[PDB]
Design a protein around this ligand. Sequence first.
Ligand SMILES: CC1=C(C(=O)Nc2ccc3[nH]ncc3c2)[C@H](c2ccc(F)c(C(=O)NCc3ccccn3)c2)NC(=O)N1
Length: 499
Amino acid sequence: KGKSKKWKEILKFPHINQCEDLRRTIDRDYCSLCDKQPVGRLLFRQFCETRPGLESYIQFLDSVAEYEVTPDEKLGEKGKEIMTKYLTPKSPVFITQVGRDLVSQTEEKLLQKPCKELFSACVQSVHDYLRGEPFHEYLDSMYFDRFLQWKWLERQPVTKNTFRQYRVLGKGGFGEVCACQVRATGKMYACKRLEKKRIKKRKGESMALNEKQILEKVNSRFVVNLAYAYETKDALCLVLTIMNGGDLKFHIYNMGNPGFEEERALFYAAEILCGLEDLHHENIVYRDLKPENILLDDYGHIRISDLGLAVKIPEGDLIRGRVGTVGYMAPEVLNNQRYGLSPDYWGLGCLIYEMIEGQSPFRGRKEKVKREEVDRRVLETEEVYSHKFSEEAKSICKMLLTKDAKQRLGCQEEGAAEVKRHPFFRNMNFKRLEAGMLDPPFVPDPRAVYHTDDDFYSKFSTGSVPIPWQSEMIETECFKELNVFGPHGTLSPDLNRSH
Ligand SMILES: CC1=C(C(=O)Nc2ccc3[nH]ncc3c2)[C@H](c2ccc(F)c(C(=O)NCc3ccccn3)c2)NC(=O)N1
């Protein structure tokens, strides 16, 4: 399925003794090793399936997975099924390490009205059990041994020969993004290639590193994810979630009637709002919200896709910096004031207005107007609203485009939640949107085609990102095919240490 012919050789396990060094120097943390890291999760689960009794605790955990995705109308029926499979005195798969005391509390919260995070405490205590003896036993096992081999692979050098590069997907001041493919696994990504020459000439180091490190640590369904970072002779590359559906600028202006139906604009706004929330949760200010930085995936969901201008603000501090794009810079930025998260709500106002109207609020579409004058309109004029806005669209745009940062919607104690409560979004179910369970109102046509250096370079090129790399191995069935053990209760050669 797009894999090279030698992929099994490329991904050949190392012998287990070559992982001696890893064994000594890996934090032996349950949540990370048996839940968060996806290959570690599967291996810990495999191990459990060989110990009489533990497959109950995992079956239960899967049953709750299914519950947390179950709708409200059927939350009761499913809650009752789980109760009489796993938790009662008489249940067939009784789990004893969840208190009867907690069973009691949970029955009472149940018979009232089922609350999506109902088994909050029961899942917790289950993990409290699994992290003791079972986990420590897992560490003794063949199955962790195998995890270390997977980890070994995860850390192998990444170079341009790990990938193949195809069509250009997008372009910018500092380089271009192409569709690329991992040779060994066939998985598709987008490779953002930044010429070393341009970075140095423009002193773009900070921006490049900021972007890499922020994409590395953010994990949001509304922001492109980072899977690899590496260097070539002439470039620095980021391998990112592939977004094949075009950017919002294109979609806005690709019609008689530039501008969307409110339904659709609402929807994008909500997803972008969530994206902003995820970044703010980490104290990142984005600073460059504009339609060309939002892209669609194949299903019509969006992600914030460029973070060159984003920056981490230490807790309890403000930053200075007159950066951004003309027409999308907030007054406090244009005035070179110190600011925090506020400019992003300004940008969100700009995006909603433009999605509805088909034009920046301070700038006609294809209007010959100079930077100086746009900046002037941003600071000195109020924006106008046409017949195209419902009252609630108008309301939210004005509230987000309040010139004073301190008084602007989204910049109070509730943060983003205040924006989610605005009537404009009165129909939108955010919990489901945040869980990826709302279908978008438009699916894109797949038929369209739209010295101090060296130090910086080593900090940039860290290789594979652990969790994305493991998901890749699973998703592409490299895990399933290669994760084989010795036959009939023995060790495979890669695991024998007499070798
Ligand atoms: C979103 C976006 C570009 C883009 O297409 N990015 C992109 C990102 C992830 C992706 N996955 N699938 C397609 C895809 C496309 C495109 C672009 C492409 C390559 C670039 F290098 C830049 C670019 O220069 N961005 C600014 C920057 C400055 C400093 C450090 C890093 N970045 C912009 N132009 C733009 O204004 N925004």
